PDB file of all heavy atoms in Angstrom:
ATOM      1  N   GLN K   1      99.378  92.085  70.722  1.00  0.00           N
ATOM      2  CA  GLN K   1      98.362  91.410  69.940  1.00  0.00           C
ATOM      3  C   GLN K   1      97.147  91.199  70.778  1.00  0.00           C
ATOM      4  O   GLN K   1      97.168  91.112  72.058  1.00  0.00           O
ATOM      5  CB  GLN K   1      98.987  90.065  69.474  1.00  0.00           C
ATOM      6  CG  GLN K   1     100.114  90.121  68.528  1.00  0.00           C
ATOM      7  CD  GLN K   1     100.419  88.803  67.822  1.00  0.00           C
ATOM      8  OE1 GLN K   1      99.936  88.576  66.714  1.00  0.00           O
ATOM      9  NE2 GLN K   1     101.271  87.986  68.407  1.00  0.00           N
ATOM     10  N   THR K   2      95.990  91.100  70.069  1.00  0.00           N
ATOM     11  CA  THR K   2      94.731  90.748  70.670  1.00  0.00           C
ATOM     12  C   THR K   2      94.189  89.568  69.924  1.00  0.00           C
ATOM     13  O   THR K   2      94.019  89.517  68.779  1.00  0.00           O
ATOM     14  CB  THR K   2      93.765  91.950  70.593  1.00  0.00           C
ATOM     15  OG1 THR K   2      94.340  93.133  71.092  1.00  0.00           O
ATOM     16  CG2 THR K   2      92.525  91.713  71.383  1.00  0.00           C
ATOM     17  N   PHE K   3      93.780  88.515  70.758  1.00  0.00           N
ATOM     18  CA  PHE K   3      93.298  87.313  70.254  1.00  0.00           C
ATOM     19  C   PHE K   3      91.865  87.181  70.646  1.00  0.00           C
ATOM     20  O   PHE K   3      91.461  87.210  71.763  1.00  0.00           O
ATOM     21  CB  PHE K   3      94.141  86.157  70.779  1.00  0.00           C
ATOM     22  CG  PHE K   3      95.614  86.261  70.547  1.00  0.00           C
ATOM     23  CD1 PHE K   3      96.338  86.926  71.451  1.00  0.00           C
ATOM     24  CD2 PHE K   3      96.194  85.730  69.468  1.00  0.00           C
ATOM     25  CE1 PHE K   3      97.757  87.095  71.247  1.00  0.00           C
ATOM     26  CE2 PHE K   3      97.567  85.836  69.210  1.00  0.00           C
ATOM     27  CZ  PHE K   3      98.322  86.507  70.173  1.00  0.00           C
ATOM     28  N   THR K   4      90.978  86.880  69.663  1.00  0.00           N
ATOM     29  CA  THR K   4      89.553  86.715  69.823  1.00  0.00           C
ATOM     30  C   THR K   4      89.119  85.374  69.175  1.00  0.00           C
ATOM     31  O   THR K   4      89.902  84.647  68.501  1.00  0.00           O
ATOM     32  CB  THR K   4      88.802  87.847  69.072  1.00  0.00           C
ATOM     33  OG1 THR K   4      89.344  88.038  67.758  1.00  0.00           O
ATOM     34  CG2 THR K   4      88.978  89.151  69.869  1.00  0.00           C
ATOM     35  N   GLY K   5      87.847  85.032  69.478  1.00  0.00           N
ATOM     36  CA  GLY K   5      87.352  83.756  69.051  1.00  0.00           C
ATOM     37  C   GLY K   5      86.422  83.113  70.092  1.00  0.00           C
ATOM     38  O   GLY K   5      85.557  82.326  69.775  1.00  0.00           O
ATOM     39  N   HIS K   6      86.693  83.492  71.373  1.00  0.00           N
ATOM     40  CA  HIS K   6      85.825  83.096  72.405  1.00  0.00           C
ATOM     41  C   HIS K   6      84.443  83.758  72.331  1.00  0.00           C
ATOM     42  O   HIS K   6      84.299  84.841  71.781  1.00  0.00           O
ATOM     43  CB  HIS K   6      86.441  83.274  73.776  1.00  0.00           C
ATOM     44  CG  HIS K   6      87.398  82.202  74.234  1.00  0.00           C
ATOM     45  ND1 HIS K   6      86.945  80.902  74.569  1.00  0.00           N
ATOM     46  CD2 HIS K   6      88.738  82.173  74.262  1.00  0.00           C
ATOM     47  CE1 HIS K   6      87.962  80.198  74.869  1.00  0.00           C
ATOM     48  NE2 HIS K   6      89.074  80.894  74.644  1.00  0.00           N
ATOM     49  N   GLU K   7      83.449  83.114  72.944  1.00  0.00           N
ATOM     50  CA  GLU K   7      82.058  83.613  72.821  1.00  0.00           C
ATOM     51  C   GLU K   7      81.578  84.278  74.116  1.00  0.00           C
ATOM     52  O   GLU K   7      80.636  85.130  74.061  1.00  0.00           O
ATOM     53  CB  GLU K   7      81.058  82.466  72.523  1.00  0.00           C
ATOM     54  CG  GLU K   7      80.738  82.334  71.093  1.00  0.00           C
ATOM     55  CD  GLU K   7      80.115  81.015  70.660  1.00  0.00           C
ATOM     56  OE1 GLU K   7      79.731  80.336  71.613  1.00  0.00           O
ATOM     57  OE2 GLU K   7      80.017  80.704  69.509  1.00  0.00           O
ATOM     58  N   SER K   8      82.175  83.937  75.234  1.00  0.00           N
ATOM     59  CA  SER K   8      81.777  84.447  76.506  1.00  0.00           C
ATOM     60  C   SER K   8      83.101  84.797  77.291  1.00  0.00           C
ATOM     61  O   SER K   8      84.144  84.758  76.787  1.00  0.00           O
ATOM     62  CB  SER K   8      80.845  83.552  77.299  1.00  0.00           C
ATOM     63  OG  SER K   8      80.294  84.134  78.424  1.00  0.00           O
ATOM     64  N   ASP K   9      82.887  85.088  78.623  1.00  0.00           N
ATOM     65  CA  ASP K   9      83.976  85.462  79.479  1.00  0.00           C
ATOM     66  C   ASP K   9      85.110  84.499  79.510  1.00  0.00           C
ATOM     67  O   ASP K   9      84.813  83.248  79.537  1.00  0.00           O
ATOM     68  CB  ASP K   9      83.489  85.726  80.886  1.00  0.00           C
ATOM     69  CG  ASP K   9      82.488  86.930  80.962  1.00  0.00           C
ATOM     70  OD1 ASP K   9      82.593  87.781  80.126  1.00  0.00           O
ATOM     71  OD2 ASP K   9      81.583  86.829  81.796  1.00  0.00           O
ATOM     72  N   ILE K  10      86.367  84.967  79.438  1.00  0.00           N
ATOM     73  CA  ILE K  10      87.508  84.062  79.596  1.00  0.00           C
ATOM     74  C   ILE K  10      87.875  84.046  81.018  1.00  0.00           C
ATOM     75  O   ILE K  10      88.173  85.070  81.697  1.00  0.00           O
ATOM     76  CB  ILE K  10      88.660  84.585  78.686  1.00  0.00           C
ATOM     77  CG1 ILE K  10      88.329  84.340  77.159  1.00  0.00           C
ATOM     78  CG2 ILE K  10      89.978  83.880  79.079  1.00  0.00           C
ATOM     79  CD1 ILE K  10      89.461  84.879  76.314  1.00  0.00           C
ATOM     80  N   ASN K  11      87.892  82.856  81.631  1.00  0.00           N
ATOM     81  CA  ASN K  11      88.138  82.678  83.046  1.00  0.00           C
ATOM     82  C   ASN K  11      89.606  82.343  83.356  1.00  0.00           C
ATOM     83  O   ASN K  11      90.018  82.614  84.501  1.00  0.00           O
ATOM     84  CB  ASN K  11      87.274  81.520  83.545  1.00  0.00           C
ATOM     85  CG  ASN K  11      85.794  81.790  83.360  1.00  0.00           C
ATOM     86  OD1 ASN K  11      85.313  82.814  83.804  1.00  0.00           O
ATOM     87  ND2 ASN K  11      85.140  80.886  82.610  1.00  0.00           N
ATOM     88  N   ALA K  12      90.382  81.612  82.477  1.00  0.00           N
ATOM     89  CA  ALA K  12      91.675  81.133  82.825  1.00  0.00           C
ATOM     90  C   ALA K  12      92.496  81.161  81.549  1.00  0.00           C
ATOM     91  O   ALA K  12      92.004  81.025  80.454  1.00  0.00           O
ATOM     92  CB  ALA K  12      91.674  79.795  83.394  1.00  0.00           C
ATOM     93  N   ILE K  13      93.791  81.319  81.746  1.00  0.00           N
ATOM     94  CA  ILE K  13      94.722  81.470  80.549  1.00  0.00           C
ATOM     95  C   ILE K  13      96.080  80.999  81.026  1.00  0.00           C
ATOM     96  O   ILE K  13      96.493  81.106  82.172  1.00  0.00           O
ATOM     97  CB  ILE K  13      94.747  82.911  80.034  1.00  0.00           C
ATOM     98  CG1 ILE K  13      95.469  83.001  78.717  1.00  0.00           C
ATOM     99  CG2 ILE K  13      95.363  83.778  80.986  1.00  0.00           C
ATOM    100  CD1 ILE K  13      95.211  84.329  78.036  1.00  0.00           C
ATOM    101  N   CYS K  14      96.857  80.401  80.084  1.00  0.00           N
ATOM    102  CA  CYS K  14      98.230  79.918  80.385  1.00  0.00           C
ATOM    103  C   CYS K  14      98.973  79.746  79.099  1.00  0.00           C
ATOM    104  O   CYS K  14      98.448  79.378  78.036  1.00  0.00           O
ATOM    105  CB  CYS K  14      98.097  78.594  81.166  1.00  0.00           C
ATOM    106  SG  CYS K  14      97.724  77.142  80.087  1.00  0.00           S
ATOM    107  N   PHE K  15     100.248  80.018  79.156  1.00  0.00           N
ATOM    108  CA  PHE K  15     101.113  79.800  78.022  1.00  0.00           C
ATOM    109  C   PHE K  15     101.390  78.312  77.687  1.00  0.00           C
ATOM    110  O   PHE K  15     101.506  77.487  78.648  1.00  0.00           O
ATOM    111  CB  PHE K  15     102.467  80.503  78.160  1.00  0.00           C
ATOM    112  CG  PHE K  15     102.475  81.954  77.762  1.00  0.00           C
ATOM    113  CD1 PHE K  15     102.335  82.941  78.684  1.00  0.00           C
ATOM    114  CD2 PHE K  15     102.572  82.316  76.446  1.00  0.00           C
ATOM    115  CE1 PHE K  15     102.281  84.277  78.322  1.00  0.00           C
ATOM    116  CE2 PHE K  15     102.564  83.605  76.011  1.00  0.00           C
ATOM    117  CZ  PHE K  15     102.428  84.578  76.989  1.00  0.00           C
ATOM    118  N   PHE K  16     101.481  78.002  76.473  1.00  0.00           N
ATOM    119  CA  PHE K  16     102.150  76.710  76.059  1.00  0.00           C
ATOM    120  C   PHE K  16     103.604  76.751  76.579  1.00  0.00           C
ATOM    121  O   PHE K  16     104.252  77.837  76.618  1.00  0.00           O
ATOM    122  CB  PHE K  16     102.233  76.648  74.518  1.00  0.00           C
ATOM    123  CG  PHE K  16     102.407  75.236  73.980  1.00  0.00           C
ATOM    124  CD1 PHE K  16     101.315  74.429  73.828  1.00  0.00           C
ATOM    125  CD2 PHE K  16     103.581  74.800  73.565  1.00  0.00           C
ATOM    126  CE1 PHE K  16     101.484  73.159  73.305  1.00  0.00           C
ATOM    127  CE2 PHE K  16     103.825  73.585  73.109  1.00  0.00           C
ATOM    128  CZ  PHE K  16     102.718  72.688  72.913  1.00  0.00           C
ATOM    129  N   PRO K  17     104.094  75.610  77.023  1.00  0.00           N
ATOM    130  CA  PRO K  17     105.458  75.611  77.639  1.00  0.00           C
ATOM    131  C   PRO K  17     106.610  76.088  76.749  1.00  0.00           C
ATOM    132  O   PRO K  17     107.630  76.525  77.243  1.00  0.00           O
ATOM    133  CB  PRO K  17     105.607  74.205  78.074  1.00  0.00           C
ATOM    134  CG  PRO K  17     104.811  73.363  77.161  1.00  0.00           C
ATOM    135  CD  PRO K  17     103.600  74.254  76.896  1.00  0.00           C
ATOM    136  N   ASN K  18     106.389  76.071  75.355  1.00  0.00           N
ATOM    137  CA  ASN K  18     107.404  76.594  74.466  1.00  0.00           C
ATOM    138  C   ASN K  18     107.419  78.154  74.476  1.00  0.00           C
ATOM    139  O   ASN K  18     108.390  78.773  73.996  1.00  0.00           O
ATOM    140  CB  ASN K  18     107.258  76.069  73.112  1.00  0.00           C
ATOM    141  CG  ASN K  18     106.108  76.729  72.319  1.00  0.00           C
ATOM    142  OD1 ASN K  18     105.147  77.251  72.915  1.00  0.00           O
ATOM    143  ND2 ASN K  18     106.171  76.607  70.970  1.00  0.00           N
ATOM    144  N   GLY K  19     106.330  78.758  74.997  1.00  0.00           N
ATOM    145  CA  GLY K  19     106.263  80.205  75.041  1.00  0.00           C
ATOM    146  C   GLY K  19     105.758  80.939  73.786  1.00  0.00           C
ATOM    147  O   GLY K  19     105.617  82.149  73.854  1.00  0.00           O
ATOM    148  N   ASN K  20     105.485  80.206  72.743  1.00  0.00           N
ATOM    149  CA  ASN K  20     105.063  80.829  71.455  1.00  0.00           C
ATOM    150  C   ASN K  20     103.553  80.448  71.107  1.00  0.00           C
ATOM    151  O   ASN K  20     103.240  80.416  69.960  1.00  0.00           O
ATOM    152  CB  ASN K  20     105.953  80.438  70.364  1.00  0.00           C
ATOM    153  CG  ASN K  20     107.334  81.110  70.437  1.00  0.00           C
ATOM    154  OD1 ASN K  20     107.513  82.157  71.100  1.00  0.00           O
ATOM    155  ND2 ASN K  20     108.289  80.532  69.797  1.00  0.00           N
ATOM    156  N   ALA K  21     102.798  80.174  72.196  1.00  0.00           N
ATOM    157  CA  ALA K  21     101.345  79.853  72.113  1.00  0.00           C
ATOM    158  C   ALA K  21     100.801  79.950  73.486  1.00  0.00           C
ATOM    159  O   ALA K  21     101.551  80.057  74.428  1.00  0.00           O
ATOM    160  CB  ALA K  21     101.146  78.476  71.438  1.00  0.00           C
ATOM    161  N   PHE K  22      99.500  79.871  73.577  1.00  0.00           N
ATOM    162  CA  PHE K  22      98.810  79.865  74.856  1.00  0.00           C
ATOM    163  C   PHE K  22      97.409  79.279  74.701  1.00  0.00           C
ATOM    164  O   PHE K  22      96.966  79.042  73.630  1.00  0.00           O
ATOM    165  CB  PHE K  22      98.790  81.249  75.562  1.00  0.00           C
ATOM    166  CG  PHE K  22      97.896  82.250  74.899  1.00  0.00           C
ATOM    167  CD1 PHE K  22      96.667  82.536  75.312  1.00  0.00           C
ATOM    168  CD2 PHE K  22      98.291  82.910  73.649  1.00  0.00           C
ATOM    169  CE1 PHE K  22      95.768  83.471  74.686  1.00  0.00           C
ATOM    170  CE2 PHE K  22      97.469  83.753  73.021  1.00  0.00           C
ATOM    171  CZ  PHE K  22      96.212  84.061  73.575  1.00  0.00           C
ATOM    172  N   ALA K  23      96.791  79.017  75.903  1.00  0.00           N
ATOM    173  CA  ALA K  23      95.477  78.397  75.906  1.00  0.00           C
ATOM    174  C   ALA K  23      94.550  79.262  76.830  1.00  0.00           C
ATOM    175  O   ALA K  23      94.966  79.881  77.734  1.00  0.00           O
ATOM    176  CB  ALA K  23      95.503  76.989  76.323  1.00  0.00           C
ATOM    177  N   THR K  24      93.266  79.224  76.491  1.00  0.00           N
ATOM    178  CA  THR K  24      92.295  79.995  77.206  1.00  0.00           C
ATOM    179  C   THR K  24      91.070  79.137  77.445  1.00  0.00           C
ATOM    180  O   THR K  24      90.702  78.268  76.622  1.00  0.00           O
ATOM    181  CB  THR K  24      91.830  81.222  76.403  1.00  0.00           C
ATOM    182  OG1 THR K  24      91.408  80.892  75.063  1.00  0.00           O
ATOM    183  CG2 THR K  24      92.960  82.244  76.350  1.00  0.00           C
ATOM    184  N   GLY K  25      90.455  79.349  78.606  1.00  0.00           N
ATOM    185  CA  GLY K  25      89.165  78.601  78.903  1.00  0.00           C
ATOM    186  C   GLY K  25      88.091  79.704  79.089  1.00  0.00           C
ATOM    187  O   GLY K  25      88.353  80.805  79.620  1.00  0.00           O
ATOM    188  N   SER K  26      86.918  79.433  78.708  1.00  0.00           N
ATOM    189  CA  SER K  26      85.832  80.443  78.661  1.00  0.00           C
ATOM    190  C   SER K  26      84.453  79.763  79.135  1.00  0.00           C
ATOM    191  O   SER K  26      84.350  78.541  79.258  1.00  0.00           O
ATOM    192  CB  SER K  26      85.690  81.081  77.370  1.00  0.00           C
ATOM    193  OG  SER K  26      84.546  82.020  77.358  1.00  0.00           O
ATOM    194  N   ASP K  27      83.461  80.584  79.275  1.00  0.00           N
ATOM    195  CA  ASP K  27      82.088  80.163  79.710  1.00  0.00           C
ATOM    196  C   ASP K  27      81.367  79.457  78.529  1.00  0.00           C
ATOM    197  O   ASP K  27      80.316  78.915  78.859  1.00  0.00           O
ATOM    198  CB  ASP K  27      81.354  81.339  80.265  1.00  0.00           C
ATOM    199  CG  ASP K  27      81.524  81.597  81.711  1.00  0.00           C
ATOM    200  OD1 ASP K  27      82.216  80.718  82.399  1.00  0.00           O
ATOM    201  OD2 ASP K  27      81.057  82.569  82.254  1.00  0.00           O
ATOM    202  N   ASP K  28      81.776  79.584  77.349  1.00  0.00           N
ATOM    203  CA  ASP K  28      81.116  78.928  76.248  1.00  0.00           C
ATOM    204  C   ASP K  28      81.482  77.426  76.189  1.00  0.00           C
ATOM    205  O   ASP K  28      81.247  76.807  75.136  1.00  0.00           O
ATOM    206  CB  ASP K  28      81.436  79.598  74.944  1.00  0.00           C
ATOM    207  CG  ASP K  28      82.932  79.654  74.630  1.00  0.00           C
ATOM    208  OD1 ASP K  28      83.720  79.508  75.574  1.00  0.00           O
ATOM    209  OD2 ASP K  28      83.257  79.913  73.381  1.00  0.00           O
ATOM    210  N   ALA K  29      82.107  76.862  77.159  1.00  0.00           N
ATOM    211  CA  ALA K  29      82.519  75.428  77.277  1.00  0.00           C
ATOM    212  C   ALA K  29      83.514  75.113  76.188  1.00  0.00           C
ATOM    213  O   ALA K  29      83.542  73.913  75.710  1.00  0.00           O
ATOM    214  CB  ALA K  29      81.269  74.558  77.212  1.00  0.00           C
ATOM    215  N   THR K  30      84.313  76.022  75.780  1.00  0.00           N
ATOM    216  CA  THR K  30      85.368  75.732  74.773  1.00  0.00           C
ATOM    217  C   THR K  30      86.704  76.195  75.321  1.00  0.00           C
ATOM    218  O   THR K  30      86.820  77.341  75.795  1.00  0.00           O
ATOM    219  CB  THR K  30      85.147  76.374  73.449  1.00  0.00           C
ATOM    220  OG1 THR K  30      85.248  77.851  73.577  1.00  0.00           O
ATOM    221  CG2 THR K  30      83.693  76.007  72.944  1.00  0.00           C
ATOM    222  N   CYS K  31      87.767  75.285  75.205  1.00  0.00           N
ATOM    223  CA  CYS K  31      89.117  75.742  75.380  1.00  0.00           C
ATOM    224  C   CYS K  31      89.640  76.131  73.989  1.00  0.00           C
ATOM    225  O   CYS K  31      89.265  75.559  72.966  1.00  0.00           O
ATOM    226  CB  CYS K  31      89.921  74.652  75.953  1.00  0.00           C
ATOM    227  SG  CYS K  31      89.808  74.460  77.733  1.00  0.00           S
ATOM    228  N   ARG K  32      90.559  77.097  73.992  1.00  0.00           N
ATOM    229  CA  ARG K  32      91.090  77.632  72.709  1.00  0.00           C
ATOM    230  C   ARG K  32      92.609  77.796  72.810  1.00  0.00           C
ATOM    231  O   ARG K  32      93.013  78.611  73.635  1.00  0.00           O
ATOM    232  CB  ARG K  32      90.339  78.873  72.285  1.00  0.00           C
ATOM    233  CG  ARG K  32      88.827  78.713  72.010  1.00  0.00           C
ATOM    234  CD  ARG K  32      88.144  79.919  71.540  1.00  0.00           C
ATOM    235  NE  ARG K  32      86.730  79.828  71.703  1.00  0.00           N
ATOM    236  CZ  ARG K  32      85.881  79.361  70.784  1.00  0.00           C
ATOM    237  NH1 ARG K  32      86.331  78.914  69.605  1.00  0.00           N
ATOM    238  NH2 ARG K  32      84.578  79.308  71.058  1.00  0.00           N
ATOM    239  N   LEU K  33      93.315  77.212  71.951  1.00  0.00           N
ATOM    240  CA  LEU K  33      94.765  77.412  71.798  1.00  0.00           C
ATOM    241  C   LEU K  33      95.071  78.334  70.641  1.00  0.00           C
ATOM    242  O   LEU K  33      94.693  78.039  69.586  1.00  0.00           O
ATOM    243  CB  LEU K  33      95.476  76.070  71.635  1.00  0.00           C
ATOM    244  CG  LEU K  33      96.978  75.922  72.004  1.00  0.00           C
ATOM    245  CD1 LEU K  33      97.307  74.507  72.188  1.00  0.00           C
ATOM    246  CD2 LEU K  33      97.846  76.557  70.978  1.00  0.00           C
ATOM    247  N   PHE K  34      95.735  79.456  70.969  1.00  0.00           N
ATOM    248  CA  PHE K  34      96.211  80.507  70.017  1.00  0.00           C
ATOM    249  C   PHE K  34      97.737  80.427  69.959  1.00  0.00           C
ATOM    250  O   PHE K  34      98.405  79.902  70.847  1.00  0.00           O
ATOM    251  CB  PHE K  34      95.796  81.888  70.539  1.00  0.00           C
ATOM    252  CG  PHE K  34      94.280  82.055  70.798  1.00  0.00           C
ATOM    253  CD1 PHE K  34      93.863  81.729  72.144  1.00  0.00           C
ATOM    254  CD2 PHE K  34      93.417  82.455  69.891  1.00  0.00           C
ATOM    255  CE1 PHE K  34      92.557  81.882  72.369  1.00  0.00           C
ATOM    256  CE2 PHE K  34      92.119  82.560  70.175  1.00  0.00           C
ATOM    257  CZ  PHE K  34      91.658  82.250  71.413  1.00  0.00           C
ATOM    258  N   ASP K  35      98.238  80.946  68.856  1.00  0.00           N
ATOM    259  CA  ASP K  35      99.684  81.037  68.669  1.00  0.00           C
ATOM    260  C   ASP K  35      99.965  82.578  68.417  1.00  0.00           C
ATOM    261  O   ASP K  35      99.357  83.232  67.632  1.00  0.00           O
ATOM    262  CB  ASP K  35     100.199  80.205  67.562  1.00  0.00           C
ATOM    263  CG  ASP K  35      99.375  80.322  66.324  1.00  0.00           C
ATOM    264  OD1 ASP K  35      98.371  81.028  66.334  1.00  0.00           O
ATOM    265  OD2 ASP K  35      99.723  79.542  65.346  1.00  0.00           O
ATOM    266  N   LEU K  36     101.011  83.057  69.118  1.00  0.00           N
ATOM    267  CA  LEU K  36     101.358  84.485  69.054  1.00  0.00           C
ATOM    268  C   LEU K  36     101.865  84.856  67.665  1.00  0.00           C
ATOM    269  O   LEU K  36     101.526  85.974  67.203  1.00  0.00           O
ATOM    270  CB  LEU K  36     102.368  84.880  70.141  1.00  0.00           C
ATOM    271  CG  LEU K  36     102.193  84.245  71.573  1.00  0.00           C
ATOM    272  CD1 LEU K  36     103.225  84.805  72.495  1.00  0.00           C
ATOM    273  CD2 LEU K  36     100.813  84.582  72.048  1.00  0.00           C
ATOM    274  N   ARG K  37     102.655  83.976  67.107  1.00  0.00           N
ATOM    275  CA  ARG K  37     103.277  84.344  65.830  1.00  0.00           C
ATOM    276  C   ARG K  37     102.335  84.173  64.592  1.00  0.00           C
ATOM    277  O   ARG K  37     102.669  84.614  63.503  1.00  0.00           O
ATOM    278  CB  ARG K  37     104.492  83.390  65.536  1.00  0.00           C
ATOM    279  CG  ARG K  37     105.691  83.650  66.456  1.00  0.00           C
ATOM    280  CD  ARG K  37     106.825  82.676  66.212  1.00  0.00           C
ATOM    281  NE  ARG K  37     106.531  81.396  66.817  1.00  0.00           N
ATOM    282  CZ  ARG K  37     107.380  80.410  66.848  1.00  0.00           C
ATOM    283  NH1 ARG K  37     108.669  80.578  66.442  1.00  0.00           N
ATOM    284  NH2 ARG K  37     107.072  79.223  67.348  1.00  0.00           N
ATOM    285  N   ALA K  38     101.101  83.684  64.829  1.00  0.00           N
ATOM    286  CA  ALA K  38     100.114  83.666  63.794  1.00  0.00           C
ATOM    287  C   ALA K  38      98.875  84.559  64.071  1.00  0.00           C
ATOM    288  O   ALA K  38      98.077  84.707  63.249  1.00  0.00           O
ATOM    289  CB  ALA K  38      99.674  82.221  63.494  1.00  0.00           C
ATOM    290  N   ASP K  39      98.751  85.021  65.296  1.00  0.00           N
ATOM    291  CA  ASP K  39      97.748  85.951  65.761  1.00  0.00           C
ATOM    292  C   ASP K  39      96.336  85.344  65.816  1.00  0.00           C
ATOM    293  O   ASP K  39      95.420  86.052  66.256  1.00  0.00           O
ATOM    294  CB  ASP K  39      97.750  87.212  64.961  1.00  0.00           C
ATOM    295  CG  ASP K  39      96.798  88.323  65.455  1.00  0.00           C
ATOM    296  OD1 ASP K  39      97.110  88.912  66.497  1.00  0.00           O
ATOM    297  OD2 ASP K  39      95.712  88.492  64.819  1.00  0.00           O
ATOM    298  N   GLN K  40      96.100  84.143  65.349  1.00  0.00           N
ATOM    299  CA  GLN K  40      94.819  83.502  65.207  1.00  0.00           C
ATOM    300  C   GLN K  40      94.736  82.185  65.907  1.00  0.00           C
ATOM    301  O   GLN K  40      95.743  81.536  66.149  1.00  0.00           O
ATOM    302  CB  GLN K  40      94.379  83.415  63.783  1.00  0.00           C
ATOM    303  CG  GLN K  40      95.293  82.483  62.931  1.00  0.00           C
ATOM    304  CD  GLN K  40      94.852  82.444  61.488  1.00  0.00           C
ATOM    305  OE1 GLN K  40      93.671  82.387  61.152  1.00  0.00           O
ATOM    306  NE2 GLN K  40      95.840  82.440  60.591  1.00  0.00           N
ATOM    307  N   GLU K  41      93.480  81.766  66.220  1.00  0.00           N
ATOM    308  CA  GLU K  41      93.258  80.520  66.950  1.00  0.00           C
ATOM    309  C   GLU K  41      93.840  79.328  66.256  1.00  0.00           C
ATOM    310  O   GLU K  41      93.694  79.204  65.036  1.00  0.00           O
ATOM    311  CB  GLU K  41      91.779  80.363  67.172  1.00  0.00           C
ATOM    312  CG  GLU K  41      91.342  78.967  67.528  1.00  0.00           C
ATOM    313  CD  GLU K  41      89.870  78.785  67.819  1.00  0.00           C
ATOM    314  OE1 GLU K  41      89.426  79.131  68.883  1.00  0.00           O
ATOM    315  OE2 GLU K  41      89.153  78.405  66.833  1.00  0.00           O
TER     316      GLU K  41
END
C-alpha cells in the first residue's frame, strides 16, 4: 500500500503498537496517523 496526505518530506515513521496503523512526521508541521486496513489517513 501507498499512503499519501503529507505536504513535504516525511522525516520519521513508526507503527501503532497494535500493528494495524502507523504514524508519520513531516516538514509541514503535521503528524499523520494512517491505518493499513483502510489505506487512508
Side-chain angles (χ1 to χ4, degrees):
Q1 296 192 91
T2 309
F3 307 86
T4 46
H6 276 290
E7 263 166 13
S8 191
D9 294 331
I10 288 176
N11 302 302
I13 191 167
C14 78
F15 276 98
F16 199 86
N18 76 337
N20 289 338
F22 69 102
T24 52
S26 175
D27 271 353
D28 58 343
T30 67
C31 281
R32 296 184 197 269
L33 202 160
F34 310 86
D35 46 1
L36 316 185
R37 289 178 286 188
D39 186 74
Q40 62 183 318
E41 166 177 275

